[PDB]
Every structure is written in structure tokens, then in C-alpha cells.
Amino acid sequence: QESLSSWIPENIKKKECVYFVESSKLSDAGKVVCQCGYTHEQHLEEATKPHTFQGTQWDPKKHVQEMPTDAFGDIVFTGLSQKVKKYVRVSQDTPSSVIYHLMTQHWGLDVPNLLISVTGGAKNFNMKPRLKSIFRRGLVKVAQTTGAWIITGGSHTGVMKQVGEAVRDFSLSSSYKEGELITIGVATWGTVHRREGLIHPTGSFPAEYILDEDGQGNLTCLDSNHSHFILVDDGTHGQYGVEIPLRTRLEKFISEQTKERGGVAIKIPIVCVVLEGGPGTLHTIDNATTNGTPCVVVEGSGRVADVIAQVANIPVSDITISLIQQKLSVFFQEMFETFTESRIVEWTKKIQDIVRRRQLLTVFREGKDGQQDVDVAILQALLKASRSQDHFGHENWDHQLKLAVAWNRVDIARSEIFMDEWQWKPSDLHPTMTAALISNKPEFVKLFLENGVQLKEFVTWDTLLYLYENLDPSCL
């Protein structure tokens, strides 16, 4: 709390609208709203000055200014639980290295073995109890047994509301390590209901927040079940397209990072899941899939996800544009008349690509086939895409085994890894056997010793010296 309040404002900075454009459009009995949309007669609430040369109109570049952030601390959501949750306020141009350093060192989070991403539509939706319990149990189990980050949105409506709901469901029992399902949230600062009770310079420590639904306009309220929030600035009042670019950049930079524990190094795997999105999910799914993320679309209660599920295993290019139009004309009653003849083309092309690559794309099949606890389905799709990656020198085998040992699920190791891909001379399992012994994993050492590694070998002078160096650093 002493070295944290220092490492925030003089490196992280916030955007503001210096220039004083008047109101071209006045909306909802307000004249203070001027283009960007903050208060005061000018565009923003800053000093009413000519602001250098009085060039007509403003440019999101010429007239957006970056100054040090003044809002940060530990948000407490009134009487709705006493947990104290961190929050910071950032802008467009902050390199992902700064946020990663803050989140790993200053905030106290640990580097995850998996980055599960939750992106979905924001129109409120209601779904059947069976699929509801399946999703909750699967998400909580896969995100608790691997110590993964659950980065998602910070709103209180939609899929992110569902994941807040699932985190609450976990905290209901909380058999051990209740505060371990850390869920960083990403949302726009410019659209928050009670955000004026958070602007306090040089430390807004326990700044109480009040949430009130059906008291806003189009703006959004914060959630109460998440663990961390990162809010982005643009010096704008009612836009929703600023969190997605930064979130994609940060999520890409996270997977670049490598975790090295026990002597085996892996780059953090990165998975995506979607639930009934809208127009922007066909951004996020494409943007994720082109990179190589195992996007996992779920069949059931879907405006967009159900479309991929329906057109999923039907082979590529066997679908016509008119066929896609008639597919879309049976699911979108509210706006079935406001769909332009060009809106079909974008969706046709993107569905074409996504469904064309079925190695990366994976359909859940809620209850038909593969209807497990979702955790193993996500892990199975992730290892499918990892198997689909490039490998020249028998590297897929070792990488998949290293990743399985990095997690703590032996069922995956025996039912996907150790059953298939041939070869695996017993000397090959030695490097990961060391990590299994070091991290105290008895199930994996039993399995490896079953496959053929002999305790008569593998205990070398060098190996013993290595093991004694990495002895448990809490021992007499």
C-alpha cells in the first residue's frame, strides 16, 4: 500500500478532452454534453480557455490529451459482501507490459497456468436449468483446479453477469481457498453509473460504491462478484468500443509470457468461450481464431453461438448466401427487418472461415455427445489445437505432457496424452518426472513409473544435485 500508491500515477495516465467544442447535438435535456459528452459548457470540465489555437472542431489525436491517472484503490460495494476488490483506471496507450507488471507484482496475483477468456453478448438472456448448472460447474471446476485467470467484462448484464453468478456459486461452498477464483474485469470507465464517488486523487482507498439497476440510461453498472477491475479511459461519455482493442492486445501479450516452475517451461495456453453474442462477437471469435486460440462456442440459447452450432459440422462451402440468410431469418425477430443486404456478407464470410477450420472451432454439444463437466471439454479442445500446432522433432508429445503435468488432472494425461501418438521411449519421460517429483505430484509419478521409467535409472549425480537444490523452501 506504500509502494503501490507510488507506482500508478506517474507512469499510468488518463485521456482528457482539452479543447472546448460546444454542443453540436443536445440530448436528454442536456447542453453540457458536447461531442465526447462530459459536463460543463465545454467538451470537458477543464478550464474554459481558448486552449491554444482555436481550430474549428476536434480530432481524436489533436485534441485528446493524456495526463496522470487520479482514480485507484480498493472498491467496496456497500453492504453487498466485505471483500475489498482492487481497481485501476487506464487509457488507450498503455503498453501491456505495464499492466502485466502491475497485476503480477503490485496487485499480488500469480502467473496462471491457463488464461480462460469469457466474451459474450450484453443483451440479457435466460437459459435452461440443465445447461445453466452444467456451465456453472464446468467453469468453476476448470478455473479452480488449474488456477486460471477468468478475464472478462465488468458489466452486470449478460455472460459476464453469469460468470459473476458462478463465482458467487463457488463462494457459496468455498471448501478451501475461497478467494482463489480471481476474475479480472475489463470495462469502459466512461460508462459507469456511480463513478463520481471514485474520483479521488492520491489514493481512493475503500471508496464505497452503490449499484442501482433500472436507474441508468444506456450506461452500465459494475458487478459485485468479480475480484479485480481495470477500467479504460477515452475522454468519452457513451461509447462501448474502447475496451475490446486493449483487451485483445493485453490477452495476446499474456500468452507470450512463459511460466517456468520445476524445470519445465511452457507458454501459457489461451482459450475462449462465448454465449449468445451479438454483432461484436463475430469480431472476437474471428480475432481469436485467426491467431490460434481454441474458441469454444456452446450450443444452446444462442443468437450467434447457436448459429455456429447449427452450421457447425455441415461441410465448408456447401452453404449458400441465401441459405445463410434463411438461417438468420429464423432467429432474429426483433431486428429481422433492419438487416441490410450488406450485413449478410460480413456474417457469411466470417462463418465461412470459422466453420471452415474445425480443428480450432469446437462445438460443445450440450447434452448429445461429449457432455462432460465442460472442464475436460475445454481442456480437450485446447490440447486439440496444441496438437494442431507446428512440430518438427517430436515436440507435440513432450509439450502436451509438460502441460498436463503443469495442470493437476491425471485423467487428461491418461485419456488424451498417454494413450496416443505412439513412441514415448521410457527415457523420454525423465524431464517431466523431475518436475512431478519436485511439485509433489504422487498420481503423476505413479503413472510415469507405470509407463516404464525405472527408479534404478533417472537418479543420477546431476539429477540428485538438481533435486536437492530445489528442495521445499520452507523446511528445517
Binding site: 461441410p315 465448408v316 462451402s317 456447401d318 457432455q371
Partner: peptide, 19 residues
Amino acid sequence: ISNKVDAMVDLLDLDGDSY
């Protein structure tokens, strides 16, 4: 016996163009 009955409860509950 308790472990054997659980999986059984689970079982009863579950049941190209070239351009």
C-alpha cells in the same frame, strides 16, 4: 460401495469448394 454408486447415478442421470 459409496464410490461405486456415484458413477452409476451419473450414468442414470445422463441417459467443399476448391477456390
